[PDB]
PDB file of C-alpha atoms in Angstrom:
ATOM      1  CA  UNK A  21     -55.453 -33.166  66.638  1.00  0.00           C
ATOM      2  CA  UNK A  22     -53.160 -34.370  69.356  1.00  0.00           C
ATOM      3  CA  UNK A  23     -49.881 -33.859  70.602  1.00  0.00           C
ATOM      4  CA  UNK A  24     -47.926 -37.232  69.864  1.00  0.00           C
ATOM      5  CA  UNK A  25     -46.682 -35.943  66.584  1.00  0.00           C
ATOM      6  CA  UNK A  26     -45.430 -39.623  65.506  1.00  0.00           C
ATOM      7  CA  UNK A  27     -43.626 -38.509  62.165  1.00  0.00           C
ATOM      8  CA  UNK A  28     -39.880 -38.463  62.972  1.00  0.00           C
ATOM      9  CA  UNK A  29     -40.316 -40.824  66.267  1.00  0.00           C
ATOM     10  CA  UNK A  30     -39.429 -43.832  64.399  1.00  0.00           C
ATOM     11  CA  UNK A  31     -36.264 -42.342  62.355  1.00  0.00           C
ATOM     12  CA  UNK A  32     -34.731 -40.876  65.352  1.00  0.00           C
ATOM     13  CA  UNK A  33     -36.506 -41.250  68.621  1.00  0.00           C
ATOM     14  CA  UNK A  34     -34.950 -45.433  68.075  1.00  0.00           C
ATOM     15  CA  UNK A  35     -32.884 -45.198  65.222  1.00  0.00           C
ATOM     16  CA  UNK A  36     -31.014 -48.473  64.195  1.00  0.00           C
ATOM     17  CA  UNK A  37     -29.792 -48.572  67.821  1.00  0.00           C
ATOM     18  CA  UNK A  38     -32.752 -49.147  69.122  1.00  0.00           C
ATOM     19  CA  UNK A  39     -33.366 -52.511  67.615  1.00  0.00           C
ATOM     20  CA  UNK A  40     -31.400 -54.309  64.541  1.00  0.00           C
ATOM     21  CA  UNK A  41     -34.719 -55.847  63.782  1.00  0.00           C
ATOM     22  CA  UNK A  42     -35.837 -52.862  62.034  1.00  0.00           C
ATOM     23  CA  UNK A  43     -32.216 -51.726  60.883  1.00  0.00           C
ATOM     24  CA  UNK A  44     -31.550 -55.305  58.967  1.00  0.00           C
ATOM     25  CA  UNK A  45     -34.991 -55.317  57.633  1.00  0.00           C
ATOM     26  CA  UNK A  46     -34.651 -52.254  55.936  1.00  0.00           C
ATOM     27  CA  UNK A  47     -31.090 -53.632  55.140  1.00  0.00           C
ATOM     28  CA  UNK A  48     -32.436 -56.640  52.977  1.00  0.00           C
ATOM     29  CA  UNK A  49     -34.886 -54.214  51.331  1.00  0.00           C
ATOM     30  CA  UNK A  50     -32.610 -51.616  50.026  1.00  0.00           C
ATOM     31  CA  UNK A  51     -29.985 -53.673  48.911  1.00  0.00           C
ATOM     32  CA  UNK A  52     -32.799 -55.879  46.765  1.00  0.00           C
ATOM     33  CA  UNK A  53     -33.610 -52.667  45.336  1.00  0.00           C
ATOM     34  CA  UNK A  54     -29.991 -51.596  44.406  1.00  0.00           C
ATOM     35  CA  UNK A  55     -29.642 -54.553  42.683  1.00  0.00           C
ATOM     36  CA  UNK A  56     -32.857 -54.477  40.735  1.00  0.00           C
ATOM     37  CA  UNK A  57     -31.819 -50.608  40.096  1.00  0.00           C
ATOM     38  CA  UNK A  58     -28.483 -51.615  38.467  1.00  0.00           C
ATOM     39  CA  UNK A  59     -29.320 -54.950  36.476  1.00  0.00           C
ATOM     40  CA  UNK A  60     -32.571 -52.664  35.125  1.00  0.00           C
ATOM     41  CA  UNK A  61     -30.378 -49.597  34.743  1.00  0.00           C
ATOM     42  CA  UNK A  62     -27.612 -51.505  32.128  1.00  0.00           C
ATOM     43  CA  UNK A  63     -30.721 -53.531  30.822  1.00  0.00           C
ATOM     44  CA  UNK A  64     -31.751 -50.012  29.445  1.00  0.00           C
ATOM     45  CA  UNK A  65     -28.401 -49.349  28.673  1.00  0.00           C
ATOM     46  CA  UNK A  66     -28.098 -51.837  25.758  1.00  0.00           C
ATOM     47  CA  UNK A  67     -31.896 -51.678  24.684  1.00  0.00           C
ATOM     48  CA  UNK A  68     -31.382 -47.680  23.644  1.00  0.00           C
ATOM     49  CA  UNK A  69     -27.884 -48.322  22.923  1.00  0.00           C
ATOM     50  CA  UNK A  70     -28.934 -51.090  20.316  1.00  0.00           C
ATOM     51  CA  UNK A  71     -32.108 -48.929  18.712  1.00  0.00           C
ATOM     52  CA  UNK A  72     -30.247 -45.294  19.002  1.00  0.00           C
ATOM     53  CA  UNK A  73     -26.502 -46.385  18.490  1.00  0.00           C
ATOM     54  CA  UNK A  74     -25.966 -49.026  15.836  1.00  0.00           C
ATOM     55  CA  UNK A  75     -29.551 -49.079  14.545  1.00  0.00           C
ATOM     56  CA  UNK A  76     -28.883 -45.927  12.522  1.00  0.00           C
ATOM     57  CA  UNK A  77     -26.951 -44.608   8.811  1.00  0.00           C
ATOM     58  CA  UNK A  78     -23.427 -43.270   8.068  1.00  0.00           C
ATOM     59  CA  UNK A  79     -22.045 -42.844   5.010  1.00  0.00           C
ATOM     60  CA  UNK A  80     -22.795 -45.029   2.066  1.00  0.00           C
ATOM     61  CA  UNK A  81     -23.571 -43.305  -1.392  1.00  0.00           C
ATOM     62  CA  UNK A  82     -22.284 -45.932  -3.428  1.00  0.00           C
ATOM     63  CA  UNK A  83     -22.257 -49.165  -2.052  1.00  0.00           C
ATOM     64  CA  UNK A  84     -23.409 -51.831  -4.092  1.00  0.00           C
ATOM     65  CA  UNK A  85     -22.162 -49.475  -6.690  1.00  0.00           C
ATOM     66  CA  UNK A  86     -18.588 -50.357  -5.493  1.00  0.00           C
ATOM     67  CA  UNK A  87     -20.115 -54.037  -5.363  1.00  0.00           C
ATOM     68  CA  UNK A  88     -21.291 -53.787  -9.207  1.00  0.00           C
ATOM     69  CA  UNK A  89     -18.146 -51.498 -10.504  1.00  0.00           C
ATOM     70  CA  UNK A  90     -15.697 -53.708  -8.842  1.00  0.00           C
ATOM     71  CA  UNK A  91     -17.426 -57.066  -9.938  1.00  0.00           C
ATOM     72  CA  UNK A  92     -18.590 -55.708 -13.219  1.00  0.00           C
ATOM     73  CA  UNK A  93     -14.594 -55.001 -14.325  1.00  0.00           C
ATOM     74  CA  UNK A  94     -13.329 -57.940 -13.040  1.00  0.00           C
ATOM     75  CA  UNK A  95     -16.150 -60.721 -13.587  1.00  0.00           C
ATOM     76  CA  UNK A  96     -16.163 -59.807 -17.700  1.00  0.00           C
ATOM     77  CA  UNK A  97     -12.633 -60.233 -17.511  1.00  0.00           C
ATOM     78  CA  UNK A  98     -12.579 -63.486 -16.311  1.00  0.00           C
ATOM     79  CA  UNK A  99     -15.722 -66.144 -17.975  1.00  0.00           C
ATOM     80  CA  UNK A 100     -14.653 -69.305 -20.078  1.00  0.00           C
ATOM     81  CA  UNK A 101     -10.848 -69.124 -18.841  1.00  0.00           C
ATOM     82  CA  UNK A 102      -8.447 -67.172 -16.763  1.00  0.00           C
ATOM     83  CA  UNK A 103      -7.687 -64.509 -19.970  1.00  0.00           C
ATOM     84  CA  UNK A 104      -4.707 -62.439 -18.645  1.00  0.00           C
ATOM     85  CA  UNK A 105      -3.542 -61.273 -21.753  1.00  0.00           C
ATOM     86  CA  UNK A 106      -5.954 -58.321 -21.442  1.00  0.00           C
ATOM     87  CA  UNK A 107      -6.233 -57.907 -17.926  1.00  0.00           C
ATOM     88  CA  UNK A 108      -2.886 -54.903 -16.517  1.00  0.00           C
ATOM     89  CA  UNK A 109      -1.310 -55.392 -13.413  1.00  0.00           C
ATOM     90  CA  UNK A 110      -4.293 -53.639 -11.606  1.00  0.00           C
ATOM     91  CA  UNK A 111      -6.838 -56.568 -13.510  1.00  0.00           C
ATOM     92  CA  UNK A 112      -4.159 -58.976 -12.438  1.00  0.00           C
ATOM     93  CA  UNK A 113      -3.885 -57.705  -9.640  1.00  0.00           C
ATOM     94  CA  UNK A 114      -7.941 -58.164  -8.532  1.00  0.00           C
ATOM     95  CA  UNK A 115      -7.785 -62.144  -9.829  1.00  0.00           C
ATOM     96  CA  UNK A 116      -4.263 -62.514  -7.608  1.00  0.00           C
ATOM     97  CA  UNK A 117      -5.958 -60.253  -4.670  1.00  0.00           C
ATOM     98  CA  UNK A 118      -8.817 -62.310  -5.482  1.00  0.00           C
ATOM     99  CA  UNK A 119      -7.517 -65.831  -4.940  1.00  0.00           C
ATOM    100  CA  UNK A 120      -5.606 -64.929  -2.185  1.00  0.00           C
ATOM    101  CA  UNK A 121      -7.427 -62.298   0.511  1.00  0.00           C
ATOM    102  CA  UNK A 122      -9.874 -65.618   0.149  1.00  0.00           C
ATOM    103  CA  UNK A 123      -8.206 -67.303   3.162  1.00  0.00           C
ATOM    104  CA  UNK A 124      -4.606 -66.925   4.198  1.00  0.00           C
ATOM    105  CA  UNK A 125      -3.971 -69.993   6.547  1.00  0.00           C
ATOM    106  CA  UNK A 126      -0.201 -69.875   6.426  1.00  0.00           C
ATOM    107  CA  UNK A 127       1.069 -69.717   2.861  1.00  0.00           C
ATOM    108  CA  UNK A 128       4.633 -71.349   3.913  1.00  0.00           C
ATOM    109  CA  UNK A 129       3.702 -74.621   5.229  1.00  0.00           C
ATOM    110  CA  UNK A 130       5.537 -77.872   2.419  1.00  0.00           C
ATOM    111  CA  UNK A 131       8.505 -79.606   4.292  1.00  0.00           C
ATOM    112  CA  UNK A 132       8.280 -79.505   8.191  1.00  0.00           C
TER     113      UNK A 132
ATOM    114  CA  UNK B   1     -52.103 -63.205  44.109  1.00  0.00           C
ATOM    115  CA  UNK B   2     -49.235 -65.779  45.867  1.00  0.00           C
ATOM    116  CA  UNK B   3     -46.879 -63.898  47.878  1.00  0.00           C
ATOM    117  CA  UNK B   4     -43.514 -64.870  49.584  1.00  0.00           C
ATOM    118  CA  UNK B   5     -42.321 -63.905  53.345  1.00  0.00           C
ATOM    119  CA  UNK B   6     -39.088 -63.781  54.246  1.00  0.00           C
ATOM    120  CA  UNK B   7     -38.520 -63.996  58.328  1.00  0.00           C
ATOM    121  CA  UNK B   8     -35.313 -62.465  60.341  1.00  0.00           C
ATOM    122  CA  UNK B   9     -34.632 -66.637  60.133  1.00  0.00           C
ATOM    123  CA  UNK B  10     -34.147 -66.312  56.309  1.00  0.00           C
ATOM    124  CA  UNK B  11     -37.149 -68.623  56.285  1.00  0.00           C
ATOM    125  CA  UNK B  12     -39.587 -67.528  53.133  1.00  0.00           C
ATOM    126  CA  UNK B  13     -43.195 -68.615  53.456  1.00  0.00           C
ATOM    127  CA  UNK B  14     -45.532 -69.177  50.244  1.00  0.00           C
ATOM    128  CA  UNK B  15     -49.059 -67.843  51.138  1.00  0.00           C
ATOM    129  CA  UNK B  16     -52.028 -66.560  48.510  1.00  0.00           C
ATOM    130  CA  UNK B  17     -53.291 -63.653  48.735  1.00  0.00           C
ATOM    131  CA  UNK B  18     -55.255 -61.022  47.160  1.00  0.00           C
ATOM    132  CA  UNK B  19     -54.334 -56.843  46.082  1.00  0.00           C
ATOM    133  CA  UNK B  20     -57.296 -55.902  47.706  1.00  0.00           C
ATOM    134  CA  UNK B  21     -55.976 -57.872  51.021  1.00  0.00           C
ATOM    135  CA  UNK B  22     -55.059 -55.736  53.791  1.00  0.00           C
ATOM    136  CA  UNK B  23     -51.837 -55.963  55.858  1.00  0.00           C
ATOM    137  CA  UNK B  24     -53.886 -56.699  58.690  1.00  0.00           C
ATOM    138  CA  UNK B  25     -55.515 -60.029  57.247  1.00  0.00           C
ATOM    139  CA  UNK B  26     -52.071 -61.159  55.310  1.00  0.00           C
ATOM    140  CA  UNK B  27     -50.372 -61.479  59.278  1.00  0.00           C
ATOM    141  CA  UNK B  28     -53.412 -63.433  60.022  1.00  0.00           C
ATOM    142  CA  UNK B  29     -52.427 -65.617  57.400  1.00  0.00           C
ATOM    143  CA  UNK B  30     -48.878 -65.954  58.463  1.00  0.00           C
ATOM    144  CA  UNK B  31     -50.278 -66.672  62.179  1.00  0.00           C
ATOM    145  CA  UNK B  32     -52.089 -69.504  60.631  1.00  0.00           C
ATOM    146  CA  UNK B  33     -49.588 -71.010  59.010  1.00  0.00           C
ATOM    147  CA  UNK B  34     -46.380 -70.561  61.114  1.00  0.00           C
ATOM    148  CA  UNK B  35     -48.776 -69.696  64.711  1.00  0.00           C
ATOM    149  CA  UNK B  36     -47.341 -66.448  65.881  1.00  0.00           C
ATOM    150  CA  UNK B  37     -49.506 -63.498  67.043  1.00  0.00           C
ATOM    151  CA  UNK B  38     -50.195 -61.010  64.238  1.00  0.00           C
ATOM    152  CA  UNK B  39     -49.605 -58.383  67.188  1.00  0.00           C
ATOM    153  CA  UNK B  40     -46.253 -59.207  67.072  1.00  0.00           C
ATOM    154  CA  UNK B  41     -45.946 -59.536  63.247  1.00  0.00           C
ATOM    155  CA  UNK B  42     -44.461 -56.702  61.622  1.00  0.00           C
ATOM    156  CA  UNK B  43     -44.688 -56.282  57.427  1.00  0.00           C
ATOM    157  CA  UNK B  44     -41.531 -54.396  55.973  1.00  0.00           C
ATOM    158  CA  UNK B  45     -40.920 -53.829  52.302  1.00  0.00           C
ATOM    159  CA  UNK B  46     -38.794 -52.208  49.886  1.00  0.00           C
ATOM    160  CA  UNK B  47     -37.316 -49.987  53.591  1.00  0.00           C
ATOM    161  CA  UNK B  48     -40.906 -49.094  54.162  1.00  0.00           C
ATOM    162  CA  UNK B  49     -43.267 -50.394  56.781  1.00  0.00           C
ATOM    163  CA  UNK B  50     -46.245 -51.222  55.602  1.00  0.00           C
ATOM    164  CA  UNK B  51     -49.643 -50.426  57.609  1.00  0.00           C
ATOM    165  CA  UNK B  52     -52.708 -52.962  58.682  1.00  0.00           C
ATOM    166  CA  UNK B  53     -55.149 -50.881  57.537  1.00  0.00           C
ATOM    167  CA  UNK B  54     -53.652 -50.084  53.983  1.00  0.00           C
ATOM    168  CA  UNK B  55     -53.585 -53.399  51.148  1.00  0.00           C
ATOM    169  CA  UNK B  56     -51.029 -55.022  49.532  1.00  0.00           C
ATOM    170  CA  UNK B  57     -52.454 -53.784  45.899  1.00  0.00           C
ATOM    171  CA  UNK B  58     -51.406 -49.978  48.098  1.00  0.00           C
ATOM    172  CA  UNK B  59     -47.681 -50.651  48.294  1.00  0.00           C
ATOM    173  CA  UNK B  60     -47.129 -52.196  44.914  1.00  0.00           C
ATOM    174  CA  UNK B  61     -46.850 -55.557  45.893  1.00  0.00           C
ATOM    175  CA  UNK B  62     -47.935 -57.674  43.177  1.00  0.00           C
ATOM    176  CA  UNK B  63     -47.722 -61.535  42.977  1.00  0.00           C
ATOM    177  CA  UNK B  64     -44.209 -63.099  43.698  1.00  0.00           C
ATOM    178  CA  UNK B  65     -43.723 -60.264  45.998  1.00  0.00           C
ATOM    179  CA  UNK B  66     -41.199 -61.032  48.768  1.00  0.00           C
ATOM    180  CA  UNK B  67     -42.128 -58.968  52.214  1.00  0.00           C
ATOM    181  CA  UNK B  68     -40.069 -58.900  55.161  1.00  0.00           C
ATOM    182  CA  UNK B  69     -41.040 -60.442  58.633  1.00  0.00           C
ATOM    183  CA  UNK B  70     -40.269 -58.749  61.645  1.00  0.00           C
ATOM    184  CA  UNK B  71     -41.624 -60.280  65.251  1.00  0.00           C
ATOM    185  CA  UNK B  72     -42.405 -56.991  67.501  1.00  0.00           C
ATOM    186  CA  UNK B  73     -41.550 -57.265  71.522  1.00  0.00           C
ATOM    187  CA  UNK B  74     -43.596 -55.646  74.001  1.00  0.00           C
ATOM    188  CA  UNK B  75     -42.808 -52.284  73.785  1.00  0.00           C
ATOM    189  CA  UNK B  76     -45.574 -49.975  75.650  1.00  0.00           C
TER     190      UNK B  76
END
C-alpha cells in the first residue's frame, strides 16, 4: 500500500547501536527464556528417563524361584537346632555365609 | 489476570489485568500507577515487542507474566 516498508527498519536501520534500551530489553528476555529452556529441557530429561529407562524388564525367569530353591534347601535344614551333621560344606557353607554376609562391621576388633 | 513489570530500573510493578486487555490500556495502567506517558511506554517480552492494538491473551502472557518496560524518547 505504501512505500515505508517497516519490516527490517527496526533490526537494522537502529540495530543495538542505536539505543541499548531496546538491546538490554531483549537481553533480559532471552536469557529468561534460556533458562526456562534448560531447567524444562533436563526436567524432561529425568521424567522420560524415569518412565522409559528404569521403568522397564530385563532378565528374570526365575527369581523368587532362586528365593524359594535357595531358602527351601537351607531353611529345612536348619528348624529346632543348628543340625550340621547333615548339612556338606556347601549346606555349611549357606548357615556360615548366612551369619556372616549379615553385617560385616570389622570382624577383628577385641583388645585395642 | 495480575501481571508484573519490570522497568530498565529493575523496578517490577504488580498491576491486574485481563487476556482480553490490550497493550494499549495495560500502559495506561502503568501511567496510573507510576505517572509516565503511555506514549513513551514501550511493552517488550520474551525479545518481542508487543503492539497496542494486539492483547496480552495474543502474546501468551498469562497471569504472573513479567513484561519489560522501556520509556521511548522523541524520536520523529
Amino acid at each position: 500500500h505504501m512505500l515505508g516498508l517497516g519490516a527490517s527498519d527496526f533490526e537494522f536501520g537502529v540495530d543495538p547501536s542505536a539505543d541499548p534500551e531496546l538491546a538490554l530489553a531483549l537481553r533480559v528476555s532471552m536469557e529468561e527464556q534460556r533458562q526456562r529452556q534448560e531447567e524444562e529441557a533436563r526436567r524432561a530429561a529425568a521424567a522420560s528417563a524415569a518412565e522409559a529407562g528404569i521403568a522397564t524388564t530385563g532378565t528374570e525367569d526365575s527369581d523368587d524361584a532362586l528365593l524359594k530353591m535357595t531358602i527351601s534347601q537351607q531353611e529345612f535344614g536348619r528348624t529346632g537346632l543348628p543340625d550340621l551333621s547333615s548339612m556338606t560344606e556347601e549346606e555349611q557353607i549357606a548357615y556360615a555365609m548366612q551369619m556372616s554376609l549379615q553385617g560385616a562391621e570389622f570382624g577383628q576388633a577385641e583388645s585395642a | 489476570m495480575q501481571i508484573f513489570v519490570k522497568t530498565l530500573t529493575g523496578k517490577t510493578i504488580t498491576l491486574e489485568v485481563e487476556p482480553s486487555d490490550t497493550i494499549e490500556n495495560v500502559k495506561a495502567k502503568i501511567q496510573d500507577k507510576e505517572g509516565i506517558p503511555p506514549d513513551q511506554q514501550r511493552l517488550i517480552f520474551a525479545g518481542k515487542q508487543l503492539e497496542d492494538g494486539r492483547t496480552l491473551s495474543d502474546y501468551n502472557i498469562q497471569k504472573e507474566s513479567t513484561l519489560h518496560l522501556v520509556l521511548r524518547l522523541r524520536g520523529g
